[PDB]
Amino acid sequence: SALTQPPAVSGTPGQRVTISCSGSDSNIGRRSVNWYQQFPGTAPKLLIYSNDQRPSVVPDRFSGSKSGTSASLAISGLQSEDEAEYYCAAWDDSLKGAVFGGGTQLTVLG
Amino acid sequence: QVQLVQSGAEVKKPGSSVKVSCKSSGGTSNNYAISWVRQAPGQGLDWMGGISPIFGSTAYAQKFQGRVTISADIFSNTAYMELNSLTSEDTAVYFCARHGNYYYYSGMDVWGQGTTVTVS
Amino acid sequence: QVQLVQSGAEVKKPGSSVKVSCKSSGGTSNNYAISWVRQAPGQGLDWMGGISPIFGSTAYAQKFQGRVTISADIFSNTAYMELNSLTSEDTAVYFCARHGNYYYYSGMDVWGQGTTVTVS
Amino acid sequence: VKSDQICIGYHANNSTEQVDTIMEKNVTVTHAQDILEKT
Amino acid sequence: LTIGECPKYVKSNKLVLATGLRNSPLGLFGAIAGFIEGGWQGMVDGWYGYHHSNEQGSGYAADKESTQKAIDGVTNKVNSIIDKMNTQFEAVGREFNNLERRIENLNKKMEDGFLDVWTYNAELLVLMENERTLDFHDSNVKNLYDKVRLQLRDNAKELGNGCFEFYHKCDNECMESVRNGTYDYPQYSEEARLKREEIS
Amino acid sequence: GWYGYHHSNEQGSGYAADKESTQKAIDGVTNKVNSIIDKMNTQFEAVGREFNNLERRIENLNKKMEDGFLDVWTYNAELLVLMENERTLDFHDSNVKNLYDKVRLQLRDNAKELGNGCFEFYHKCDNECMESVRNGTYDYPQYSEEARLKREEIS
Ligand SMILES: *[C@@H]1O[C@H](CO)[C@@H](O)[C@H](O)[C@H]1NC(C)=O
Ligand SMILES: *[C@@H]1O[C@H](CO)[C@@H](O)[C@H](O)[C@H]1NC(C)=O
Ligand SMILES: *[C@@H]1O[C@H](CO)[C@@H](O)[C@H](O)[C@H]1NC(C)=O
Ligand SMILES: *[C@@H]1O[C@H](CO)[C@@H](O)[C@H](O)[C@H]1NC(C)=O
């Protein structure tokens, strides 16, 4: 645990959706938050690192932000291929290890 | 490019142990940290630990400390994970994941295909 | 530990020369200065000279200058002392003594067992 | 008051692994690698 | 004598490559055990790094760029050491009769000489690259100190023990600007000379 | 000593060796020489083998093997001597540089760096002060007040 995510989000294609990740002082407030996208039955993919940075293979519609002890992942212009589980992850200084969120299943309406 | 290739799926009895490897193919991974992340069916990802072999760091989760053994081979470019005292709670899909640098703060940009361990 | 092992006792005629060795056993002595100290019967200790072989210093006493030759072998860890033109005043007990560092200021903490030279 | 300080240092641990060099023998290092199989 | 996919035989009884730096539980470039008297056991996330200490708190941080460069260099050095000695002599079994003892002695001295040559090569490469690795770590610490010293210039007084005390109020954003090498001289120079005048 | 000092205060002048760095350098050079001897103790030793006139091919093979081993070990000895001569001279240069850096980081701004290996003291450094800077125990705040002053009155 130690990172709180909403279990499910929904939206239409083309709609901007946001996924929140609530943590504490020792994990999000003092370390960088990584975002992972996982389709069912496949390995996770790196989506956002360093809170706001993006890999070159990840499209520019994915963006991340961090303020205080919380993080946010924004997907502007939703598509059909963005239906996946989304995990936030950061290093925890109190547990001396990496912690993950509960997981956010995104449902593409229509 | 570097692809992480894991071992096959394992079927185990309770009370036994399972050893899962993660061979780094297409290039070395000794200068990066390779983490071990498990995923229970219907649950989220869970960090077990990792090894940074040239850097010399071997980290473990506090909920997995004393039960999991993670080692690395720098001559075969293979990272290993041995989990002892298997119960039904240890049924998960086990991923090896290479970090962006030598330590565990960076994002895991290279992942293995996964290894399903079922305990019954 | 390092023990300094000298040669046996020598019986010499006047006008001849005597060569006394000091083998460093149990470890090297090339990084320390090995002095040569003689002791006349009924008199006190007298410094003849010394050699610091890796440092490259070979010192002699002013009252022994031109008459004593002190050399060192760093491959056999042996320090040698050759004294020429022996008279009856050269009858003494001759000690090799290793200093506390590379030079001759420090105290001589390792000593040889002594070599008695009698000239008659 | 106390002035702000920054320092440059380096990693140390409780390791007793020893390596040999030409000029120094059995040097204790933080991390070492056995490249020889004895078993 | 071996068969199969085997490691290379050497007559050495110890062959250990140094990957980490020198241990200080309590060189050519004079930083490791030089003007910096000892290593930090509280700094676990890197080989080299920083210990900031200001009014917002004190703690350790690693220089991940120099640590990653050093780890890349040590990894490539180990791979090169393995790669250059992949073409080692492999002794195979030859047998000779009692009227062929001269050719038998020739074969024995040939294989023994090749094993001695490759044992010398492995031992000397381990010794030389252990010196190069320890001096490389010392140079990395010296270069990190030089990088911070040339960043701060006269806005910080070096205390001669590897530390810089600042002449200005350097907060956590200032400390991380030092750490990434994006320290800005003219934002703090006037208050630095004001503090230098006030402590003169 | 191999490395050292030359103080020039009002009580006199003279040379003084740094026995700590000189002893460490002599230990390193001694251990280097011992390592050079010990690593080449397993050298090829040629032995005499004789062959008849119908065994010239094995004779050429034997002499080529022994000449090649002698050439390999000659190359090893020559290259180790050349490489360790570079490493020794650079080691001595690094020792002098490290001694200079040690004194420079001891004195800080209490001495003027003359750029020729010497340090112009701002404060009056007597023989006890020179012994303090010789064995790494120079106290900066004892002399810093008069050094800062003398900087003001000399500037
Ligand atoms: C090398 O190790 C041996 C055995 O542990 C020890 O006796 C010796 O002191 C070490 N060498 C040095 C120079 O410290
Ligand atoms: C490592 O050594 C330090 C002193 O250098 C000591 O305080 C510490 O307890 C040691 N670590 C462990 C795990 O015992
Ligand atoms: C890194 O450098 C940037 C340069 O813009 C600076 O703003 C920042 O404070 C530094 N951050 C860290 C975490 O080192
Ligand atoms: C420097 O050396 C002298 C002579 O060995 C010693 O007595 C002294 O304590 C040292 N100097 C200081 C200031 O401690």
Numbering used by the authors:
A (entry chain M): 2 to 9, 11 to 27, 27A, 27B, 28 to 95, 95A, 95B, 96 to 108
B (entry chain I), C (entry chain H): 1 to 52, 52A, 53 to 82, 82A, 82B, 82C, 83 to 100, 100A, ...
D (entry chain B): 8 to 46
E (entry chain B): 300 to 325, 333 to 506
F (entry chain C): 352 to 506
Wording from the paper:
Avian influenza viruses, including H5N1, preferentially bind glycans bearing terminal α2,3 sialic acids. The influenza virus preference for α2,3 or α2,6 sialic acid linkages creates a major species barrier for avian influenza viruses to spill over into humans. We find that H5 from A/Texas/37/2024, an isolate from the dairy cow outbreak, has increased binding breadth to core glycans bearing terminal α2,3 sialic acids, the avian receptor, compared to historical and recent 2.3.4.4b H5N1 viruses. We identify a single mutation outside of the receptor binding site, T199I, is responsible for increased binding breadth, as it increases receptor binding site flexibility.
To ensure the reliability of our predictions, we determined the cryo-EM structure of A/Texas/37/2024 in complex with LSTa and broadly neutralizing monoclonal antibody CR9114. Overlay of the modeled structure and the cryo-EM structure of A/Texas/37/2024 revealed a nearly identical structure and positioning of LSTa within the RBS. A/Texas/37/2024 binding to LSTa based on the experimentally determined structure highlights the critical role hydrogen bonding of the sidechains of residues H183, S185, N186, E190, and Q226 for LSTa binding. Moreover, Van der Waals interactions with L133 and Sia-C11 and backbone hydrogen bonding between V135 and R225 with LSTa further support HA binding to LSTa. A Cryo-EM structure of rH5 from A/Texas/37/2024 bound with the sialic acid and first galactose-2 of LSTa (magenta) and CR9114 (gray). In particular, we found a long-lasting water-mediated hydrogen bond of Sia-1 (O8) of LSTa with the sidechain carboxyl of residue E190, an important residue for mediating α2,3 sialic acid receptor specificity. Structurally, position 199 is located on the backside of the 190-helix. T199I resides in a loop on the backside of the 190-helix that leads into the 220-loop of the RBS. Thus, the T199I mutation would lose these stabilizing hydrogen bonds, leading to more flexibility within the RBS. Thus, our findings suggest that the expanded binding breadth to glycans even bearing terminal α2,3 sialic acids, is mediated by an increased flexibility within the RBS of A/Texas/37/2024.
